[PDB]
Amino acid sequence: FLGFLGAAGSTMGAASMTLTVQARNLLLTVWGIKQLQARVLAVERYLRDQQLLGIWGCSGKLICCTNVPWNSSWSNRNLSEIWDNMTWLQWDKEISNYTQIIYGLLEESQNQQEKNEQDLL
Amino acid sequence: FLGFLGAAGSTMGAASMTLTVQARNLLLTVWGIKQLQARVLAVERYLRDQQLLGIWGCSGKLICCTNVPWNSSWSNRNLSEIWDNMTWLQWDKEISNYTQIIYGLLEESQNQQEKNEQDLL
Amino acid sequence: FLGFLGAAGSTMGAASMTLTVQARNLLLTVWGIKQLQARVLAVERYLRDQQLLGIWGCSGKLICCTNVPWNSSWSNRNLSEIWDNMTWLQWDKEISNYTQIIYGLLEESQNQQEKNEQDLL
Amino acid sequence: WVTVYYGVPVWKDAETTLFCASDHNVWATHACVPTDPNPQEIHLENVTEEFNMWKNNMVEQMHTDIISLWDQSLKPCVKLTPLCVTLQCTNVTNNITDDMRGELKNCSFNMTTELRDKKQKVYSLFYRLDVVQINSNKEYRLINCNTSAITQACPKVSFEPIPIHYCAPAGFAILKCKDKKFNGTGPCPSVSTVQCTHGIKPVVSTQLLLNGSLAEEEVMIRSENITNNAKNILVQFNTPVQINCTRPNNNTRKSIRIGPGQAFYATGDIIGDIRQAHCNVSKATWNETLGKVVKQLRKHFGNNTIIRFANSSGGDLEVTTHSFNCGGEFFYCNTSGLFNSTWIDSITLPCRIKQIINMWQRIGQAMYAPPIQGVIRCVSNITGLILTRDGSTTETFRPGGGDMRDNWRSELYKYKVVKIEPLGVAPTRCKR
Amino acid sequence: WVTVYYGVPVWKDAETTLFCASDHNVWATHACVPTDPNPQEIHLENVTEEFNMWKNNMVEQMHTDIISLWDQSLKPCVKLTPLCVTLQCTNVTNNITDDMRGELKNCSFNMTTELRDKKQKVYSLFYRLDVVQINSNKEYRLINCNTSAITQACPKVSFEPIPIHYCAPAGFAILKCKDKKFNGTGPCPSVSTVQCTHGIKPVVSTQLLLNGSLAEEEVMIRSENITNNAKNILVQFNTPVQINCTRPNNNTRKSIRIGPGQAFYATGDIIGDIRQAHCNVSKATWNETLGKVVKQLRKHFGNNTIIRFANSSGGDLEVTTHSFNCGGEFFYCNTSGLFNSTWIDSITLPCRIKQIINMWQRIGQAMYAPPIQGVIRCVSNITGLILTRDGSTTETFRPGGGDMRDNWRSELYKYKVVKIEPLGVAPTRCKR
Numbered sequence A, B, C: 001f002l003g004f005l006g007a008a009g010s011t012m013g014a015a016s017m018t019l020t021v022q023a024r025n026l027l028l029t030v031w032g033i034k035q036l037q038a039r040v041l042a043v044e045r046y047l048r049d050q051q052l053l054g055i056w057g058c059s060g061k062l063i064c065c066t067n068v069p070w071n072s073s074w075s076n077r078n079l080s081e082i083w084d085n086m087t088w089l090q091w092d093k094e095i096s097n098y099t100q101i102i103y104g105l106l107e108e109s110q111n112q113q114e115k116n117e118q119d120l121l
Numbered sequence D, E: 001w002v003t004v005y006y007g008v009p010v011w012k013d014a015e016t017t018l019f020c021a022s023d024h025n026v027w028a029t030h031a032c033v034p035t036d037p038n039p040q041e042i043h044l045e046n047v048t049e050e051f052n053m054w055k056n057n058m059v060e061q062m063h064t065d066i067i068s069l070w071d072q073s074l075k076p077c078v079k080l081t082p083l084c085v086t087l088q089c090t091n092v093t094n095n096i097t098d099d100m101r102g103e104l105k106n107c108s109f110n111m112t113t114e115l116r117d118k119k120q121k122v123y124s125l126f127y128r129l130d131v132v133q134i135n136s137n138k139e140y141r142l143i144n145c146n147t148s149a150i151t152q153a154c155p156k157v158s159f160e161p162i163p164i165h166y167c168a169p170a171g172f173a174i175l176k177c178k179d180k181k182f183n184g185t186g187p188c189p190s191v192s193t194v195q196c197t198h199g200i201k202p203v204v205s206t207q208l209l210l211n212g213s214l215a216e217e218e219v220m221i222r223s224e225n226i227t228n229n230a231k232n233i234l235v236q237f238n239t240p241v242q243i244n245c246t247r248p249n250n251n252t253r254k255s256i257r258i259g260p261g262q263a264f265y266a267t268g269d270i271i272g273d274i275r276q277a278h279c280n281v282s283k284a285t286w287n288e289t290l291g292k293v294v295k296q297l298r299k300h301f302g303n304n305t306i307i308r309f310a311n312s313s314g315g316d317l318e319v320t321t322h323s324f325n326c327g328g329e330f331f332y333c334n335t336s337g338l339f340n341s342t343w344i345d346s347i348t349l350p351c352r353i354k355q356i357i358n359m360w361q362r363i364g365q366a367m368y369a370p371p372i373q374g375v376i377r378c379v380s381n382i383t384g385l386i387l388t389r390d391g392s393t394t395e396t397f398r399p400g401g402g403d404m405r406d407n408w409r410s411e412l413y414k415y416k417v418v419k420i421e422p423l424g425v426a427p428t429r430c431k432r
């Protein structure tokens, strides 16, 4: 089918089947420095996202189901609109202002279960 | 016992007990650039293999058991020959032409179970 | 509350609730080389610790419960002293001489269960 | 309810460092990544993206990269410091036509030798634009002597504008707008993702854009603000106009040793007749082309408006003329024969030649262009114009230029660089 | 059935960048990684690996690294441009022996001073190989004046060939062939993995290989193609031949200031008698050694074949003689006394000395070697030869050389660089 970003205009539930397509595309001394800086940055950006998935308990996954409830104030829409009408670019704009709140909540719930799992052992 | 690559001449099942031995060995401005390029490359190569294990569902493991059947056309041999007679260098030559097919199948089966696991939750 | 290293003077069990605080802080051509070397090193140090957690079976976790027994010769103290009186800086000094022994044991027990888990499948 | 996805096809505008790739150059030689023989392009269905060619930092990057590469290619070459001497000059009158009477000067001077103890008397030909009369009526100095050091370009490095492909680093992507009739700003449909840009030739010129790409259907007028007379108008042709330029003088070159391992390349006597350099533009083609340009200008200025073309305003030769580099020599051609009309064989444009070149718009770094032996003939495509509007029933357009960024903006207008942001969250209906 | 393993002991041939490590140098100083005091070597049981010393890119890398380090060590040193002047020269006849009559010249010249307004008359001794007669029968110039600029090596940086260890970057490994009687190509058993190479001394020489490693059991003959007379033969001895070289002239040095913070080091009058530089090779040792070489050549050419040794062919001094650098001075010794025999005290080889050196095989970068005070005595090991076969019942062997890669290929022949490929799959009998 289409490769990298081919699903960009597709709906969210049509997309999200192509997650490995995008994940794999994230990987004279003056020209040397410019190229190394570009390569070092690609590595650093990749690792920051991986660390973040790790602290949320989603390490090694592309689709991670969490234990944080959705607040209707973040987006009062049903699943039919979100997954069948909207694209990911549109969604990202709609909930931009709630991203940091959601991220904080994801970290907190992982810390709590990580500890509960120790008490049960 | 022997360290890095010590098991190279050993059979596949004698080897594969030494996986941590090899895994741990993967980690004037002109000399500066040459050394940084070597270090940056070592990091990039390491991360590509880790990403690949991740999309196959083998993150965090050295021995990963998958859900893809073996096609006898890739190598029509039994377990006794593969694990007790052959070395890993010999095996790699024998199935070189099927590596990309196998990798594609591993990615596909992970995508399918990753989705089934969401429907069950 | 306090941020990075804020818990440094806290006891071990008061600390160890702040693990994500510290984990997130680990991330003219001559000035170019100096800065790149600092950035490349930060990446390499991060990855060595992650590889090590991986071979011990603790990938993706901040608190990992293992299957290696504690030898009283490493530190003959009870849990009350270790978790309620001591700080992590004090503890690190107390068991510095046993760190490599413990690390070797952690690798060995993971290799054994990684293999047992294959036989059971 | 909250679920986390990684690998989500989302992006944001971004500014990054792009690297060069390509299939004895001034620019890209071995410090350039070999290209992919089968590069990818992915059409994005249902994607509308906003582009703005006037805010495109790929242009600023290219400008910086070509200047830096230019300098690195002069750095190891011969310094001509010993040449800034008093010259004794007379006129070249041997078989000189009227068109060049007084254009070439025959100058003698006392040059250094391999040995510090000895001097040599040598002579060479210079163009009048390369020298300044001082004081003794035959005494001259080179034009750059009171301004800057001059170096000689190494005569092994060509100036041929071999194309460069710009490629994005991982985590970034280049989006291409394929919408025909795209005027440089606003949204456009028909967006595709590419690994790298097409090959863009770093052709350096003023007034007329040479050897670039063509418009897909019709002549297009692009500007930052079409009603602002302080802004330039870039005109892209949908058909080329062929232009043939030449220096019809059989030159010879001589090497003067000036030091232990260094030599100056001087122009020797001209073989045969001496004639003026010039460029030929087919008249009918130019007239048809200009036809199309006016038809499109009227869309912005009125279809009952009188549109006049006029030659350039006064100022520095580097701006008022059509500058280009061909065959290894720098030409300054007079375009008043192209821009002289109300509304809308061959047209011959006379040209001047210089040896001392101040590149870009810098002061302090001059270069000497070694002469080229034999006769130079160039054939190239005019692919567009840079116009400035002079300004209630009529408008006057004149040739403009000199700011090299306008010559790259015309090729990079289709590209945008974005950053990929693979994480996202959404509600779903599952629970860990 | 499919299972995935990570950390699999598999490798492929690869080409990468190796870094230098080591335990006022030209080469490795502080830009070199300190070595591991207890380096590892791992024997690989049951591993057969194919090696090819003639396709080993470690050789190309070493060649590039040593040339670049060489240049970086001359870059900050004094330029001798002011020295390329007319010299007034006479002969040194004071206590001169017959062997050197006409070899040294006493030259006077007008040199610059710290102050731009003043000149000084100075004199120094030069070897006849450093100067060219011009025109006035006493007028000379330095040999490099019509070719290249010359710089003076800084007399604080020694040329002593301190050993360099090459180490692989992570993800790569160096395999060593320990198979005795390994001729450079084909498979060999007894392969071990090492972190780094042993220390290899960047000794620069022609014809005779000095101070290298020895063969483990017997003299070995190695070539790319033993039947191709266009290829060189590398001969590795299993025993050293000791060679003693000297310059028996008590020289003195004088410093001539030539500018504000710069000085030229000149050779002053020679103290005592003036005698020819030479090298001594024990005759019996040479004869036994040559014995062993022929015995082995016969394995490829026939045991009833007549093998003759002859001196070098004509050509540039740098090729036809045995060049080496010892004590800080560059010697050119005549080896016709070593290669003059059919089949198979001391042998004295006369030598010439030069001050102006064109390194490697480059043109354009010359260096002046400051003179060394006192008397030079060197003791070194001949560890092998570079031979060329001149070619129906006989073969003639002559000394060869000049291509420095042949001097490193002789130490790096045991090493191969491979890339580790840790992933692999195999059938097993389990199911996720």
Ligand SMILES: *[C@@H]1O[C@H](CO)[C@@H](O[C@@H]2O[C@H](CO)[C@@H](O[C@@H]3O[C@H](CO)[C@@H](O)[C@H](O[C@H]4O[C@H](CO)[C@@H](O)[C@H](O)[C@@H]4O)[C@@H]3O)[C@H](O)[C@H]2NC(C)=O)[C@H](O)[C@H]1NC(C)=O
Residues within 6 Å of the ligand: D157, D158, D160, D161, D203, D210, D211, D324, D325, D326, D327, D328, D378, D379, D380, D381
């Ligand atoms: C617009 O594009 C056209 C073509 O796409 C381009 O014209 C080309 O210019 C080059 C350079 O002037 C021409 O190539 C030269 O042709 C002459 C013919 O006698 C040769 O002598 C030249 O070779 C010498 O110089 C070389 C420099 O490295 C040396 O390597 C060589 O040994 C010789 O010394 C050289 O081949 C080329 O033929 C034309 N192309 C065509 C189709 O005519 C034009 O210049 C571009 N316009 C601008 C303004 O850049």
Ligand SMILES: *[C@@H]1O[C@H](CO)[C@@H](O[C@@H]2O[C@H](CO)[C@@H](O[C@@H]3O[C@H](CO)[C@@H](O)[C@H](O[C@H]4O[C@H](CO)[C@@H](O)[C@H](O)[C@@H]4O)[C@@H]3O)[C@H](O)[C@H]2NC(C)=O)[C@H](O)[C@H]1NC(C)=O
Residues within 6 Å of the ligand: E157, E158, E160, E161, E203, E210, E211, E324, E325, E326, E327, E328, E378, E379, E380, E381
């Ligand atoms: C083959 O290997 C042998 C040894 O392995 C090597 O011989 C060594 O050469 C060096 C350089 O000629 C000798 O060291 C010198 O000895 C003289 C004796 O009077 C000293 O004066 C020298 O010191 C001066 O120069 C130094 C340079 O940095 C200064 O730092 C110092 O202050 C002095 O100015 C210097 O010590 C060394 O002794 C010999 N070794 C032996 C055993 O004789 C030989 O050259 C190698 N062959 C080749 C061709 O490289």
Ligand SMILES: *[C@@H]1O[C@H](CO)[C@@H](O[C@@H]2O[C@H](CO)[C@@H](O)[C@H](O)[C@H]2NC(C)=O)[C@H](O)[C@H]1NC(C)=O
Residues within 6 Å of the ligand: D091, D092, D093, D094, D106, D107, D108, D123, D269, D270
């Ligand atoms: C430029 O001037 C030089 C002299 O400075 C001319 O060269 C001389 O031409 C005459 C003609 O017979 C010769 O006899 C001389 O020997 C030439 N002098 C040298 C130094 O070669 C030269 O021809 C003039 N060039 C032009 C184009 O007018």
Ligand SMILES: *[C@@H]1O[C@H](CO)[C@@H](O[C@@H]2O[C@H](CO)[C@@H](O)[C@H](O)[C@H]2NC(C)=O)[C@H](O)[C@H]1NC(C)=O
Residues within 6 Å of the ligand: D334, D335, D336, D337
């Ligand atoms: C460019 O070419 C034109 C055409 O040859 C030159 O035009 C002449 O300019 C002088 C200046 O007053 C006029 O008197 C002539 O009548 C003009 N000729 C024509 C046909 O118009 C023009 O000067 C050239 N420009 C430059 C800067 O040299």
Ligand SMILES: *[C@@H]1O[C@H](CO)[C@@H](O[C@@H]2O[C@H](CO)[C@@H](O)[C@H](O)[C@H]2NC(C)=O)[C@H](O)[C@H]1NC(C)=O
Residues within 6 Å of the ligand: D211, D214, D240, D379, D380, D381
């Ligand atoms: C001037 O423009 C024409 C038209 O674009 C160029 O000729 C085309 O070159 C492409 C190269 O692949 C061919 O596919 C086209 O078929 C050509 N068109 C025609 C009509 O032949 C021409 O090469 C350009 N000239 C220069 C000097 O670049």
Ligand SMILES: *[C@@H]1O[C@H](CO)[C@@H](O[C@@H]2O[C@H](CO)[C@@H](O)[C@H](O)[C@H]2NC(C)=O)[C@H](O)[C@H]1NC(C)=O
Residues within 6 Å of the ligand: E132, E146, E147
């Ligand atoms: C620099 O000067 C030397 C010495 O005159 C030139 O080398 C001579 O070239 C002639 C050409 O026929 C030979 O016959 C001589 O034997 C050469 N002499 C030596 C010592 O080799 C050299 O060619 C000159 N270099 C340049 C660039 O002109």
Ligand SMILES: *[C@@H]1O[C@H](CO)[C@@H](O[C@@H]2O[C@H](CO)[C@@H](O)[C@H](O)[C@H]2NC(C)=O)[C@H](O)[C@H]1NC(C)=O
Residues within 6 Å of the ligand: E091, E092, E093, E094, E106, E107, E108, E123, E269, E270
């Ligand atoms: C080289 O020539 C110089 C002169 O150019 C000789 O130096 C002179 O030697 C006489 C001997 O009594 C002294 O009186 C002079 O004062 C010396 N001149 C200078 C400038 O010192 C020098 O000895 C000659 N060297 C050799 C080796 O012959």
Ligand SMILES: *[C@@H]1O[C@H](CO)[C@@H](O[C@@H]2O[C@H](CO)[C@@H](O)[C@H](O)[C@H]2NC(C)=O)[C@H](O)[C@H]1NC(C)=O
Residues within 6 Å of the ligand: E334, E335, E336, E337
């Ligand atoms: C190298 O040394 C040999 C031996 O001293 C020199 O050989 C002499 O060469 C001349 C040239 O014709 C002969 O006439 C002599 O008879 C040779 N002597 C002997 C003993 O054979 C040789 O010339 C030297 N090589 C160089 C390049 O100087």
Ligand SMILES: *[C@@H]1O[C@H](CO)[C@@H](O[C@@H]2O[C@H](CO)[C@@H](O)[C@H](O)[C@H]2NC(C)=O)[C@H](O)[C@H]1NC(C)=O
Residues within 6 Å of the ligand: E211, E214, E240, E379, E380, E381
């Ligand atoms: C010439 O070769 C001999 C033989 O390899 C070198 O002497 C050996 O040096 C090693 C260094 O560890 C000792 O272990 C050997 O026992 C030595 N052999 C003998 C017979 O003593 C000698 O140093 C070499 N000479 C030079 C100048 O490198």
Ligand SMILES: *[C@@H]1O[C@H](CO)[C@@H](O)[C@H](O)[C@H]1NC(C)=O
Residues within 6 Å of the ligand: A071, A072, A073
């Ligand atoms: C949902 O968000 C609002 C503010 O936007 C907050 O007050 C409310 O408590 C949130 N719901 C829950 C369950 O926390």
Ligand SMILES: *[C@@H]1O[C@H](CO)[C@@H](O)[C@H](O)[C@H]1NC(C)=O
Residues within 6 Å of the ligand: A076, A077, A078, A080, A081
């Ligand atoms: C639920 O889906 C229906 C489909 O028509 C839509 O009209 C309704 O507004 C959606 N719910 C919300 C909260 O918007």
Ligand SMILES: *[C@@H]1O[C@H](CO)[C@@H](O)[C@H](O)[C@H]1NC(C)=O
Residues within 6 Å of the ligand: B071, B072, B073
């Ligand atoms: C096994 O491979 C062959 C081709 O090599 C293919 O046709 C066959 O369908 C494969 N088996 C399965 C179960 O897909």
Ligand SMILES: *[C@@H]1O[C@H](CO)[C@@H](O)[C@H](O)[C@H]1NC(C)=O
Residues within 6 Å of the ligand: B076, B077, B078, B080, B081
């Ligand atoms: C199975 O193992 C036996 C052992 O002798 C071997 O002969 C046989 O060929 C093997 N099976 C296959 C498919 O080769």
Ligand SMILES: *[C@@H]1O[C@H](CO)[C@@H](O)[C@H](O)[C@H]1NC(C)=O
Residues within 6 Å of the ligand: C071, C072, C073
């Ligand atoms: C505990 O450590 C001691 C040495 O410090 C060792 O002898 C003992 O066997 C260890 N205990 C176990 C269970 O291995």
Ligand SMILES: *[C@@H]1O[C@H](CO)[C@@H](O)[C@H](O)[C@H]1NC(C)=O
Residues within 6 Å of the ligand: C076, C077, C078, C080, C081
């Ligand atoms: C256990 O805790 C008590 C608390 O007072 C302490 O006294 C005792 O020494 C501890 N055990 C060990 C092994 O030190």
Ligand SMILES: *[C@@H]1O[C@H](CO)[C@@H](O)[C@H](O)[C@H]1NC(C)=O
Residues within 6 Å of the ligand: D093, D094, D095, D272, D273
């Ligand atoms: C002009 O050209 C002719 C062509 O042969 C030549 O003979 C004549 O000498 C030239 N005139 C001068 C002054 O060089």
